[PDB]
Amino acid sequence: GHMKASSNKRRYRKDGFDLDLTYVTDHVIAMSFPSSGRQSLFRNPIGEVSRFFKTKHPDKFRIYNLCSERGYDETKFDNHVYRVMIDDHNVPTLVDLLKFIDDAKVWMTSDPDHVIAIHSKGGKGRTGTLVSSWLLEDGKFDTAKEALEYFGSRRTDFEVGDVFQGVETASQIRYVGYFEKIKKNYGGQLPPMKKLKVTGVTITAIQGVGRGNGSDLSMQIVSERQEVLLCKFAEGYNCALQYDATDDCVTCEVKNCPVLAGDIKVRFMSTSKSLPRGYDNCPFYFWFNTSLVEGDHVTLKREEIDNPHKKKTWKIYRDNFTVKLTFSDAE
């Protein structure tokens, strides 16, 4: 009878394959995670994905797994898998990014028919960071913005909730920009190392954010996956808070910061349940690299901070919401 007995752009549906896989270029593929067991959200069984590569690019593929959270049976891909450990909604260290670029360069230079396939979980934020960096390396684009937007056009749904298309976070945009700066100003290698200590943090348009005066906020500095400083503002825990109602800002002296080098992640937490958490289990956060800092501070506008960069938050983080870190030289 009428009742049965049983039961997009990103879809590759050719030659008996049905996969969440995109040729960003003829030789650079972006895809979602090659999954096992049950299929949820219709994304990509590993047996099929590995069959695809062995059939379409026999002996001429290399797979990049960008998920810190999980690996898989790499022998399904004949051991042609390289891992870049990136947490969801975060960025690779620049050391890890450049190591990836060199690995891909060695592989791609060896044969013009070689392909690379880059994946994460959804194959958007982390994947787009590395795909866009690779396309800069390979000379297809000269700016991070163009590379990111191309990635967005090939791989992603258009998001009205984003300022810019392509990736998931503001730090992801920043890190492709860092790679552009490295390629154009430093010959493709890291800039001279610069060590820093954070001595202050200033937040503008504080009204309406948590308790609206800095008193609910704390700031955690993370280096190489470890907390290296925690400041709790109202309490004076490694800090001293000053709130100015007239100027709608808080300025905090930061105390006891260790010497910082490399990629630094700064997370802001709140005791106010009324201030929503976004990605990374906090209200707002960002990454920066100490060697790419200019002068004695780094200032980030709303669209440059992870979580406030989403339009769905703009009733809380107003047009003039910014965060500035003030530094001292560690050398």
User: CB neighbours of 121 closer than 8 A, spacing ≥ 6?
Assistant: 32, 33, 67, 69, 88
| CA distance linking residue 284 with residue 288, whole number of Å | 14
- The domain 1-189 is placed in CATH, from the list 3.40.50.720, 3.90.190.10, 3.30.2010.10, 3.60.15.10, at 3.90.190.10
Nearest 5°: the CA angle 43, 49, 50 is: 150
| Under 8 Å between Cβ of 97 and 131 | no
Residue 273 tokens read as: 């349940």
Q: Which amino acid is at 300?
A: L
Sheet holding 263-270, edge to edge: 226-232, 217-223, 263-270, 284-289
Parse the chain into domains and list their residue ranges: 1-189, 190-331
Which class is 190-331 in CATH? mainly beta
Residue 70 tokens read as: 């999980």
For the beta carbon of residue 312, count every other beta carbon within 10 angstroms.
11
Q: Which residues on adjacent β-strands are paired with residue 204?
A: 249, 322
